[PDB]
Design a protein around this ligand. Structure first.
Ligand SMILES: O=C1[C@@H](NS(=O)(=O)c2ccc3cc(Cl)ccc3c2)CCN1c1ccc([C@@H]2CCCN2)cc1F
Ligand SMILES: [Ca+2]
Ligand SMILES: [Mg+2]
Lengths: 52, 234
């Protein structure tokens, strides 16, 4: 197991292997955090989150 | 839903219910965004006219969070046929936007490649709805959810009396008495990944409900991701 096969490449959501390197991205309504791994909700009620 | 558990407060906020002229739920749906609902194409033949209810967990009371929405555009997949239930997918554009709140939120649409390698290789997914609690019975008045194992594709083809196309997958149990059932059609099959729920299927069909040697058959959402995208852009 390597890159995206290794624990989702440490990404919160989507993991791609561009070149021989991990590239993380997020679903609509999330912005990729400064660390390029975590997904941060842009506003209230982001998709896929149970409420309260 | 046969077996499973009640969706507790805020647990299944992407659930939509298609209601007919007499305010009765006949199918489920998944909230994709403020204007769009995902459902099964075969649900569109079960009612002359219908509306979409969101934020509902108990059909017997007013929990204060419910909201009825009229449909503006029904986008049925053209290749859908009653013969095989292949392409069992439809998208609904609403007249007015959904207001997200407690019990009302969209499920995420994943990317295909990642969804197929990482979501559909998870052990289980979660199916939900107001459908029957037993093969013979009335619709549930409470919203229910059920954890359903992904089923090996080969095993599923073997168990099925009907053709399992590439736009379908199987989930549930061989003998354990848990499954989706009548009225659950069109509803959410979602898969959890690090506390984020992604839409992975649409409740499609089954040879009865929770029968031994049979599984739940779901539309493979990953096969229609581009189509869903095109459908939402207009
Ligand atoms: O869906 C059902 C059953 N109806 S149900 O309301 O009990 C039902 C509906 C949806 C389900 C979805 C899941 Cl995931 C599990 C059980 C389900 C049971 C009765 C027979 N049946 C059913 C059986 C076979 C087919 C195939 C595909 C097209 C034609 N041959 C289609 C069917 F609709
Ligand atoms: Ca209610
Ligand atoms: Mg079974």
């Amino acid at each position: 197991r390597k890159l995206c096969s290794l624990d989702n490449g440490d990404c919160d959501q989507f993991c791609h292997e561009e070149q021989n390197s991990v590239v993380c991205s997020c679903a609509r309504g999330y912005t990729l955090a400064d660390n390029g791994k975590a997904c941060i909700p842009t506003g209230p009620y982001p998709c896929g989150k149970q409420t309260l | 839903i046969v077996g499973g558990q009640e969706c507790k407060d805020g647990e299944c906020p992407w659930q939509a219910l298609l209601i007919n002229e007499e305010n009765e739920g006949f199918c489920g749906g998944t909230i994709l965004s403020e204007f769009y609902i995902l459902t099964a194409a075969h649900c569109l033949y079960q009612a002359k006219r219908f509306k979409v209810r969101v934020g509902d967990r108990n059909t017997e009371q007013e929990e204060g969070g419910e909201a009825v929405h009229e449909v503006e555009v029904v986008i049925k997949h053209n290749r859908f046929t009653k013969e095989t239930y292949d392409f069992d997918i439809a998208v609904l554009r609403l007249k007015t936007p959904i207001t997200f709140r407690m019990n009302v939120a969209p499920a995420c649409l994943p990317e295909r490649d990642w969804a197929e390698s990482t979501l559909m290789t998870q052990k289980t997914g979660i199916v939900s709805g107001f459908g029957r609690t037993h093969e013979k019975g009335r619709q549930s008045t409470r919203l229910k959810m059920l954890e359903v194992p992904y089923v090996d594709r080969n095993s599923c083809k073997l168990s099925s009396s009907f053709i399992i196309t590439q736009n379908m997958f199987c989930a549930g149990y061989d003998t354990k008495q848990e499954d989706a059932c009548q009225g659950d059609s069109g509803g959410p099959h979602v898969t959890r990944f690090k506390d984020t729920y992604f839409v992975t299927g649409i409740v499609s069909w089954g040879e009865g409900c929770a029968r031994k040697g049979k599984y739940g058959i779901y539309t493979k959402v990953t096969a229609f991701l581009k189509w869903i995208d095109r459908s939402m852009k207009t």
